[PDB]
Please model this.
Amino acid sequence: AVQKVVVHPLVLLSVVDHFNRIGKVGNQKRVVGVLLGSWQKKVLDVSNSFAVPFDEDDKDDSVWFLDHDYLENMYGMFKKVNARERIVGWYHTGPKLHKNDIAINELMKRYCPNSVLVIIDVKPKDLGLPTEAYISVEEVHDDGTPTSKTFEHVTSEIGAEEAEEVGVEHLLRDIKDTTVGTLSQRITNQVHGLKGLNSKLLDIRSYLEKVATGKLPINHQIIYQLQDVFNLLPDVSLQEFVKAFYLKTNDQMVVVYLASLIRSVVALHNLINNKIANRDAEKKEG
Amino acid sequence: NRHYYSITINYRKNELEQKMLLNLHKKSWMEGLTLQDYSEHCKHNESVVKEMLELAK
Amino acid sequence: MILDKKFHGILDQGEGVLIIFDEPPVDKTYEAALETIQNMSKVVDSLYNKAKKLT
Model:
């Protein structure tokens, strides 16, 4: 149904507010906020959101506390001031997906339309993208397990339309723009290996752990496609790609001729002014 | 300015806004897995950029 | 007609083998060679200004 979503940083800075207005009480649980957006178009666009007092139990996980009057009053006043945005779903700040999320999401599945779920981290130490759109749809399983709520990952992007780019750029004054060239390219080409190294290294350890020490079926069926796609590149002998290395290396030669020739053109004004300026300033100095 | 003046304005930013918003904006200019759109340009150098290299020349 | 370059091909007498091939990237070596030839006059004129100002 929905291919991609658009999440503005305003809601995540509202999660920064979720971490600001705590008051140093010692709970810092998965505070659930009421996510708002535009479900009209096929693409999802989050503009702003708000929160609702949400408290769980220490031992029992099935305890969840929501509010209908606060949702209808905040949504009623927010719709009165801005009727272009309506309820879409919710989101929790907890890093782990608990079992009670089917009951928490089920309320906004009954009263509200199909709600999207977003799992983020309480500490911004994760290098990866903090936002993951998880659609709440029921899928048929091939093994015969009963139909249950399934959270499929929907791709997400963090973009701002008109003003939030200007506000973020003014508040930071440290981040740089695209700036194609040497630095913005070589930084990605340096740290990209760590950007994949922390992800893959962080995933395959618990993966290999759950291979031998795993039960409660984790959908082993998708592991066959996992190792299949991993074995779709069986160390090609590079025999056919030699001519492609001749093509890319020939373009490299083109960059060599462009650099040497163009820089040789740049040497004109320098290697002329260095003489005509020094000898004339010297002969005319005294 | 008569009977109508103004006041100075300063800002404030803690480490949670600095790292969450900074990494959020860098990620807003980066990719999902950060390895997706690299080979796109690495292999577009042979298909599309060649036109930009000929026009550049 | 191959000497007239109306299509891609080449004949043979000993074996009679027909080969058809083409070279699409023609606009690379032309612009590159023109940049080399045009830059030769740049470096030579630079050596004329410096050779004039020195000796």
Observations:
- Chain C touches chain A through twelve residues (CB under 8 Å).
- The longest helix of chain C spans residues 26-54.
